[PDB]
Design a protein around this nucleic acid. Structure first.
Lengths: 238, 238, 238, 238
RNA sequence: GCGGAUUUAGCUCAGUUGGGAGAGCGCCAGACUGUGGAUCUGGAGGUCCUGUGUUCGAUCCACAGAAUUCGCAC
RNA sequence: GCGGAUUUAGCUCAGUUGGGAGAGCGCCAGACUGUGGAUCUGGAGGUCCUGUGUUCGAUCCACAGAAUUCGCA
């Protein structure tokens, strides 16, 4: 053909071999999304169950995924360093992960929320980015970063939404009240003013969600300081 | 934070400025997809209408998309050379496009096919790639390439399936019949042996689908040799 | 062989076809270099001829180089859109250009300065970077940028070195004297305090060096506003 | 400035952190270079001493280089995984290495060969590529690969040049003679026909050259199987 | 895109309805001698592409995903 | 992750009910002049981060998405 020459303008990027690959997918404008479909605040259980369902099915579909961690509207997938999926073409991996997460989310939404059919202008869309890590310690520190982020965001949102619902404050009022406040102050505000003991909050909300290949098992525990949890799973390293 | 340092391992790729951008999305294993949901052969109208609906909605959402061409399980989107969407980040554009096409396809499928609800193991997924073209002549030639490819492939499937249906041949028999045949030979085989006049086939089947920003208008015309069609639409160039 | 596998960690980068290529080479620490070998200030003529000789020879060797502009310790080379040199492999182009400029500079230095044999710890080194530009207008604007920067740096160096040499100021003293000063002030300082008419300085010093493929001709002219200079050379565009 | 905007078209590439970097430089058309300056065959000691001098000086100039291995017209440099030279910018590293190796080669050439002044059309140029390796085992395997390649190439050149020089053959005759020949066949040809025992060849010629930071020490030993050679130098991993 | 064929040790290839994995070259060690060549002896290396399903048991059987190659076709 | 402020001519800052965009500099040319200095005239360059609407009309207003910067950690 006299037209195929344009194919020469395409440029592929193969991700460095024998390197750990993290693919992180993130909900596009899921704040507005959470508002449109009237999500429970601070945390809506079933929506998180949809997220976990999509992630788990995806994980079941692709064996190279050793571990997955999700919270709020985000999910991180760890691919074994020796992954050869799609010859490690970055675009294939990221666009496939985003496509899969979006479609599976739509499906499981149709399963968990039949009362709230999806509207064409507020469909769940995900972006996806690939990140390379040469040593496992960086993987540990990454998931540590994500879990710390989950802890901070959950504490803030629980305090905020308890201030809004129980103390009937305005979002602006709750926002100003939390200004310059630290973890101890948020816990004290929740317990004394809202009558809520944070430590008694669901483990899933405060710790996020971990899916690990054992069998596929789901945990909601601290992985930041618990070295034995990692050490007992050496196949994560391989 | 002692963990945020891992964020430094990320690499962004900004697409060269003042360049025409083509993002092509492609259905993942849609032959098998067409089999599972028992698509009509050679061409199933309603499915193609799902594709076109999804693509048109997508084009409607992003004003930077000047032109789209789709056929079978593929769709190409032209973004104007001075586009600043997501600061011209390749990953954002591609993962977002795959996600959008996927979700819109899922939505419109429930609309056109209420009789065939989607199965979790056969959801429509799309990959996506970004290609840069510095001169409009290469864009013209690109879409020319896509239309020629559509013509050849359609001619193949229509001839094959007419050989299976009208002459009651076995797939291997029809395939053996098509060895060393060219477009003209396939046309002559269809007309003389199967009694089907190709030129009378649906225009969408023979030319594919064009969505162009005018209002958004859909065409099923030749864009390869019709220079005036392009010349009459200078806003495509800039 | 059981060791050849490491070849898979290599990454090639082919520069986008049908795009103008600019390769800019720049002297490594040529201020300290100028100090060690006792360069005349503000401008040492013979050094500039070494630069120009190296650039001209390099350009003579590779016909794809259509235009070159050099000043101080930098030089810019324009390679035509359909250049296929080293299959447009970026790395080959850049390392080759840097190696060539360094070696030719060493050679022509050995020719112009036999009195000052080069010392191993002060050899002329060059870096090299490649930049892609999709439209010729951006090429014009690039070389315009380079000539403007050349004017700025030359004016600064002449004023600075006239304040240090013609007067008896310290380099830091002159630096502080020129702080927050503009072209008008520099001109006025040269005139009133140093008794130097900037405009009467050599044209090469104020405008830089242009090498054009016509035959290779060397110019010291304005290319910023002179449209006719470019328009009279359409082969530069092709 | 209204022209500085072109600066936005540059794209820099920062190498993945915590990864071992190998920068390999290789002589451009050094077959022709070897012919032009009438190099001794198969191996010219003084030329190898020029290469080695250049490499040692370069390594001496940049403390980040932990190990270097060179042979024939190529040299490989290992940079420790946490190196921050030029912020791990690929272009700067490679073009700088090419420039340095080229200039140093010119200088030491002027020192070892006062009898053979360099001709402008045959100055020594080097290309350079950077390769990332996430694990040290790959470093060991890389240098192993290069040393094996050295063994093969040296055996070939010694057998070949003994066939042209000693048996007074034409290069094409030797080329055809070595077609389909294996190491054993080459050894027997040298031994029986040329009266040459390969094992008695200089250790530098058959093993290549190793420069290691200990002090900078030079070795001509096997590094493929001698694990202790690496193990006794743990600072290479760090 | 359509179809066939293939994926097991470092390289080339076996193998068994469906049962516990091998040979030649190459590599390392020792003896031997002409040396890293020749012969001989010894030894090392493998997620049998990645998952799933059935089964007491999968390299094999069924399905799916990835990769290699050759045909036909622009 | 949560919030404040910011993005307007090449640079630096105003900036407006909601209506018609500017200054200093920079920069091109011309007259006279020490020089493309100053001084003098004319002129250019602004998609005011990007889209939609309310409107007879949008730089400010209302919705959506993005970027720089500093806090709270």
């Amino acid at each position: 053909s006299k037209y195929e020459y344009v194919k020469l303008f395409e440029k592929e990027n193969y991700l460095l071999p024998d390197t750990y690959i993290i693919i992180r997918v993130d909900g596009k404008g899921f704040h507005k999304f959470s508002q449109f479909y009237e999500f429970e605040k601070p945390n809506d259980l079933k929506a998180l169950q949809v997220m976990n369902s999509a992630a788990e099915k995806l994980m079941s579909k692709y064996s190279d995924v050793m571990l997955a961690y999700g919270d709020s509207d985000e999910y991180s997938f760890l691919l074994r360093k020796n992954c050869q999926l799609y010859e490690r073409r970055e675009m294939k991996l990221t666009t496939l992960f985003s496509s899969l997460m979006s479609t599976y989310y739509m499906y499981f939404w149709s399963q968990y929320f039949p009362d709230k059919p999806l509207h064409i202008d507020h469909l769940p869309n995900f972006d996806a980015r690939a990140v390379l890590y040469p040593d496992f310690k960086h993987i540990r520190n990454y998931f540590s970063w994500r879990q710390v982020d989950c802890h901070i965001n959950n504490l803030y949102n629980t305090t905020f939404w308890n201030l809004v619902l129980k103390l009937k404050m305005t979002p602006q009022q709750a926002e100003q009240r939390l200004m310059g406040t630290v973890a101890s102050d948020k816990n004290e505000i929740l317990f004394k003013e809202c009558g809520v003991n944070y430590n008694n909050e669901s483990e899933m909300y405060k710790k996020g969600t971990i899916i690990v290949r054992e069998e596929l098992k789901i945990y909601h525990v601290d992985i930041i300081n618990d070295d034995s949890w990692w050490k007992s799973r050496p196949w994560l390293k391989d």
